[PDB]
């Protein structure tokens, strides 16, 4: 049986899972059900070429649409972060820094829930845009999404569920090694609890899965490379597409990342 | 299983001690006596000439790490191409990991610890050289705060080598199988050696994220020429 210390972690796991469900309208559970045909009511329209894209309704237009759903996810992530115990008690400046650096890493984590090896759910699951079609977009927009797919397919082999992911994206937000943090110790103390709660969660939920905890934390290096690679591509786009406007919310996040 | 994990941890420590002349235990006592380089004048008595010497020492380290890799149980039984890929893509990560052992926030040991070059001097070198080592110092500061010792680093290092995500690997299965074993051994080791540092295993794994960022940044910024 468990002790009282484990007991507080289960309650923390429960609270975070609960807030996750309340902040993200499209869970992995819903996304996998749509992707695998648990559907007849949840079947998505598939976008795989020019006419199907138009029927669902070029490269810049898709990009602008990705950006603004991405801004929407910033709001959801920020809403979730407020529910992480201790986060809103932290110094305000550090709240911003943690969101600044953590938000994209979470966006790509959750994006993975929306993907299989052949495409990505869009518009809260009503559409599905193939990976082949995204890669066919004119340079360099065709290169935007492939590294997320390569990651998603490796990350999705961990077979995490929403109860696991809830704590994992909390651990991401609460990183003490973020640049420019005023007070690192309170951040680390919260992540230590989160790391304990994730570890027990993975042992109970995936008891046959050896060292899943460690393999999940190692995926954090993938996320950083995705973000670091996406920032580079964005810098190229701005220079060659001088007439393409980026969101100031995202502007402020990339600024000196 | 725990008996196995200790055997592996001891085996790796033994090998690490054999393979690496300047251990963390030694470097730290030295850092607390070496010839100090702080000045153009002081370097003389001790920018391109310094980068090349770092290149020399790194080639030296690549050989120590190679020898150490081959003591890792199962490593030599991997596909020969996979052994080459793992070392190729892993040595940069190991070198900066172990360079942290020779670093404090003020400088880095050099030449078996015979010398000490200061962070401030290295920062003063003309572009792009002055900005080569600053991100390694930032990294070593946060890494050394974990207070790992040589018995901890020997398993951590082996973990880095057995990374199943290096590009071009042919048989990823035994690599992840071995690393899984190493990860267990590291987790147990950090619990016994640091029973008071909560979640030190997790925090150490997270440091791989900074490590790889550092290596990529260093790559971008980057008969005699044949050797290097
Ligand atoms: O491949 C895509 O990446 C976009 C994306 C990236 C990151 C997060 C997200 O929610 C969507 C995205 C997307 C999502 C919705 C809309 Br409308 C347009 C593009 C893709 O099709
Ligand atoms: O033996 C070494 O040669 C390098 C070196 C140091 C000082 C002057 C020099 O010409 C070469 C050098 C070195 C240079 C940069 C960094 Br950083 C770490 C070591 C050694 O350890």
Numbering used by the authors:
A (entry chain A): 203 to 259, 277 to 476
B (entry chain B): 207 to 238, 245 to 258, 278 to 453, 468 to 473
Any passages from the paper?
The crystal structures of PPARγ-LBD in complex with 1 and 3 were determined at 2.13 Å and 2.20 Å, respectively, each comprising two PPARγ-LBD monomers in the asymmetric unit. Despite the compounds being synthesized as racemic mixtures, only the (R)-enantiomer was observed in the crystals. The omit map of compound 1, calculated from the refined model, clearly showed the electron density around the ligand, occupying the canonical partial agonist hydrophobic binding region between helix 3 (H3) and the β-sheets of PPARγ-LBD. Surprisingly, compound 1 showed two distinct binding modes within the two monomers; however, its position inside molecule B seems to be the most effective for the inhibition of Ser245 phosphorylation. Indeed, no interactions between compound 1 and any residues belonging to the β-sheet of molecule A were observed. On the contrary, within molecule B, the oxygen atom of the lactone group formed a hydrogen bond with the Oγ atom of Ser342 (H-bond distance 3.1 Å), and the oxygen atom of the hydroxyl group established a further H-bond with the backbone NH of the same serine residue (H-bond distance 3.5 Å). Inside molecule B of the asymmetric unit, the hydroxyl group of the phenol moiety formed a hydrogen bond with the oxygen atom of Arg280 (H-bond distance 3.4 Å), while the bromine atom on the opposite aromatic ring was involved in a halogen bond with the sulfur atom of Met364 (distance 3.4 Å). The ligand also interacted with Cys285, Ile281, Met348, Leu 255, and Gly284 through hydrophobic contacts. Our data suggest that compound 1 prevents Ser245 phosphorylation by acting mainly on PPARγ stabilization and exerting a very weak CDK5 inhibitory effect.
Among the three subtypes (α, β/δ, and γ), PPARγ is the most widely studied as a therapeutically attractive target because of its key role in the regulation of energy balance and fat cell differentiation in adipose tissue. PPARγ is a ligand-activated transcription factor which forms a heterodimer with the retinoid X receptor (RXR) and binds to specific promoter response elements (PPREs) on the DNA, acting as a gene expression regulator. Ser245 phosphorylation by CDK5 results in the dysregulation of a subset of PPARγ target genes that are known to be associated with tissue insulin sensitization, whereas its inhibition maintains the transcription of several of these genes (and the correlated insulin sensitization) unchanged. Further studies also showed that partial distortion of the β-4 strand makes PPARγ more susceptible to phosphorylation and that PPARγ ligands serve to stabilize this β-strand, thus making this region of the ligand binding domain (LBD) less available for energetically plausible binding with a kinase, regardless of the degree of ligand agonism or antagonism.
